[PDB]
Amino acid sequence: ERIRNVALRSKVCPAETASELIKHGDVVGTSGFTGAGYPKEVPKALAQRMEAAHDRGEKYQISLITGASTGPQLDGELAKANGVYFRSPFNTDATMRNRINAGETEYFDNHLGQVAGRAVQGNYGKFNIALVEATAITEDGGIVPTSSVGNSQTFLNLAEKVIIEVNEWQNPMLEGIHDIWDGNVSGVPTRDIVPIVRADQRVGGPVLRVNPDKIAAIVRTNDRDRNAPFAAPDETAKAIAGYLLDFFGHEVKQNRLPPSLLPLQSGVGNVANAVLEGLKEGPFENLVGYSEVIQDGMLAMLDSGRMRIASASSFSLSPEAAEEINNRMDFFRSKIILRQQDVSNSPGIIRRLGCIAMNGMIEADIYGNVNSTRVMGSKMMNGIGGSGDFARSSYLSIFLSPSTAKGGKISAIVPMAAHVDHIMQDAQIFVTEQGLADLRGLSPVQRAREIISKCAHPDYRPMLQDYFDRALKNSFGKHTPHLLTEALSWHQRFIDTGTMLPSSLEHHHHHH
Amino acid sequence: TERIRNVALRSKVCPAETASELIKHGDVVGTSGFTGAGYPKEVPKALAQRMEAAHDRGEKYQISLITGASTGPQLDGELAKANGVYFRSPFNTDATMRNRINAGETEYFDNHLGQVAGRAVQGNYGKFNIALVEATAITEDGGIVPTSSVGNSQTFLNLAEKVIIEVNEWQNPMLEGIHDIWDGNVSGVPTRDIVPIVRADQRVGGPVLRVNPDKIAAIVRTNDRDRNAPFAAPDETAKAIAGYLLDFFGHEVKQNRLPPSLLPLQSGVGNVANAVLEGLKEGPFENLVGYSEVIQDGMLAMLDSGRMRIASASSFSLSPEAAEEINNRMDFFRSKIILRQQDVSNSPGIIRRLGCIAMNGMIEADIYGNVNSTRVMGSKMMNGIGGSGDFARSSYLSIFLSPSTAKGGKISAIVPMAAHVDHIMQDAQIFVTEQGLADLRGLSPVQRAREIISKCAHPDYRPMLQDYFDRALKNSFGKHTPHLLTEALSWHQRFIDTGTMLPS
């Protein structure tokens, strides 16, 4: 039995009935972070009822605040139903992305570590509903989270009414892996000192806490998380990982990093996977993770002993890795700590531990300002996520990307970024399959010489050099040279023609 | 009274010219100095003269200059005149040095002020050859008493191979006691220490910079003045901005979103900040607390009137009139002011913990509320980002304040797209101009634009901004943050071409 508090068993009801508690206009806070631990059955039932209402000319939309990304059963179903008027802080569902980019869903991608605090401040309004997925409910009414913690404790505190989905698909032995603190991290100032001085340090307990009188419904479910396929490293990712690992090796030999490096933050996807595979094969020992996510390559390193501990707010695992950790949850439970995201993404803690931040990007300009979010400056991809939390607070901020996109028709290094998420001050190292730019100690013009020479693709470097050269001669000021007449012209060229590469039918200064 | 109270260290006293000879071509020099206060004065002058002579003989002679923040004509000015600085960080306001920077003659990088010490220890600027630090006094056990700022001086003393102290008799001996220098690991090798500050008036350290006396290569007796802030009063535009902000604070308190005493306050320097402080001085919020980078004129008034109880900062930025008052009454003001290391005053962990209210200026913001603090037309440096990022991102509330226009109406402070970004949308919640106040909390980018355009933009520019936004909504590549890339930067180019952002 998953509901070990007898009194709360009387609140069990079907998903459809529970969804009726959610009203048009409501602000709904849910569990869910990197496709893990989001509610599934109540959102599906809600979406059906939303569509039915819309067909009869009746409005039915919610504001949806999450930990971070969810999955098809939540963002997907609600976006299909056109049921979300406002969304925050981070989405990866393609249907929801389309609603955002059509202006049908208003969106703001907050720094992930800040969301709980802004919720408590009231920026999203009054929370009507918290809808949270659970592994179990304990004897004294504690709520055991599932494959992520995210913002769930904050949403439970704020919401007028609470709905719990108890998912028997989630492994019972997840109980104990979470660390939930009752301290003031995101409440009213003055906040508490968050006393974390080791990545493996627990400060709290294993359960979310909530007044049982606020629980309006409990729904028994049995459904899987998103679990994206493993993105196998291609040669581009492998080259990027190779330059990065060589760099780490050099930092260690110059005593600027310990042989155990520092606590590591990375993502998911191709490049991160290549980096984790390189770390598994590399000369470094006693590694530590202090990140947003646990991904596949870590289980390997936790099992071998290459990595000693991994701190995160969520799992981001493939189907095969998901089965590996479930068959051995009692081992991995001792190696992993899942934290509230306002703790995993706490700038104070990230700086104190001296994390190495490794993040992706859409593009960077020649001065090393970074766009993480908005294609051509206007079309949302996913969101800033925790990349700003980590980039700004880290001991070392590293951005990694293929040097081109769209089969070479887009350069990831541009004269000016069409949107900025990370300013120059927040980015010290850039890595592409072309090489690694170490920007420490450099002015913007010096940053440009390094980025253009080390990171840019051969197809675009002469164009970049031409822009920079002419900017140096003609720019209003020469501290960060620009030609405002063409700074964004590569982006407009892409919009117009589908490529940033110029045609020989017209003049271009780099052909000559 | 003898300023060098350690008898043994008196034997290290030498001329500024001889001391400057310790500094070699290529050296990385860390100095005191923050908001025109407490920078070294006589050794940089002597160095500059020797640099010029060297250059004339065909000898290379340049240094890297790392400071707390801004300095003055004796340091940034003289060295820039001599073409003696190959790299400068993190914050300059001297006109001669600014001209070197914008000519590409001095390399510059404006780091977040709270991060500079940590990056210095990491080695980003290279090995420190020299620390050149101004002192009020040297204590009997060899402690270095800082002057009108603390800045990064403790870190530079730790790092540098050789140390030069300027003991400046111009500086008030009664400054001794006002500083709080922490022994702990804020900016050193990870894992760092927990910084135990949980109230803005909490002292956690001692009154002196610590340095191994064997590293002290020279002590120079000096007698010269800091820079002062302007006396000039806030005009009608600044007073209007302050009025909107104070009305906003009132409503926040009435809605129980701020305490009646508000929260610890951070304020930049300028006319607008002065207006806000004058507003608060006779405002309805009592028992105020400052947790800022700087102590300015307005704070002294409030610390005097009791309307403000304590002010924490790293430096002074005072007018001649205000400087005279504090120096006449240092007894009193010393008990009301704490001067901290800048990596503590600007610690994002502390700023968030205390829940600071950040109030900063700007060059411009775009319609989505991204902020440019630094680079005119995107390429010409003004001063630098300073501590505005430390505070904007970490604060409980991040507010940006500016006149809606500049250059007699020929520049709009609200533009379609910022030509350079220092603060992203996520780091700016409230904008105030003399036209009104935009509260952006809870809003998507297109919702932010409606508020910024209608509340903050000047009437001369508002229809142009609305026209841009409306056509972007129709024709932009994506509709989440609509832009027309062909004209996004066109107002800036129009200014470059014609001298005004207004069409013919």
Residue numbers in the entry:
A (entry chain A): 3 to 514
B (entry chain B): 2 to 505
Article, verbatim:
Acetobacter aceti strain 1023 and other acetic acid bacteria use succinyl-CoA:acetate CoA-transferase (AarC) in a variant citric acid cycle that is required for a robust acetic acid resistance (aar) phenotype. Strong selection for key roles in acetic acid resistance and central metabolism appear to have optimized the structural and functional properties of AarC, making it an excellent representative of the class I CoA-transferase superfamily. Class I acyl-CoA:carboxylate CoA-transferases produce reactive acylglutamyl anhydride intermediates that acylate CoA, forming either an acyl-CoA product and a free enzyme or a protein glutamyl-CoA thioester and a carboxylate product. A closed active site enables AarC to engage, immobilize, and desolvate acyl-CoA substrates and to stabilize covalent adducts of Glu294.
Acetic acid or acetate (collectively “acetate”) has been observed in several AarC structures without being provided in the crystallization solution. The final model contained three acetate binding sites in each subunit, related by the pseudo-twofold axis. Acetate (ACT 606A and 603B) accepts hydrogen bonds from the side chains of Ser71, Thr94, and Arg228. This is the only acetate binding site not located at the rather polar interface between subunits. The second acetate binding site overlaps a chloride binding site (CL 515) observed in earlier structures and is located on the flanks of the dimer. Acetate (ACT 605A and ACT 605B) accepts hydrogen bonds from the side chains of Asn112, Arg120, and Asn125 of the same subunit and the backbone of Gly443′ (the prime denotes a residue from the partner subunit). The third acetate binding site overlaps the other chloride binding site (CL 516) observed in earlier structures and is located near the pseudo-twofold axis on the flat “top” of the dimer. Acetate (ACT 607A and 601B) accepts hydrogen bonds from the side chains of Arg354 (bidentate) and Arg354′ (monodentate) and the backbone NH of Val196′. Protein atoms in the interfacial acetate and chloride binding sites are nearly superimposable, indicating that the acetate displaces chloride ions supplied by the buffers used to isolate and crystallize recombinant AarC(H6). As anticipated, each subunit in the AarC•acetate complex possesses active site parameters typical of other open conformations.
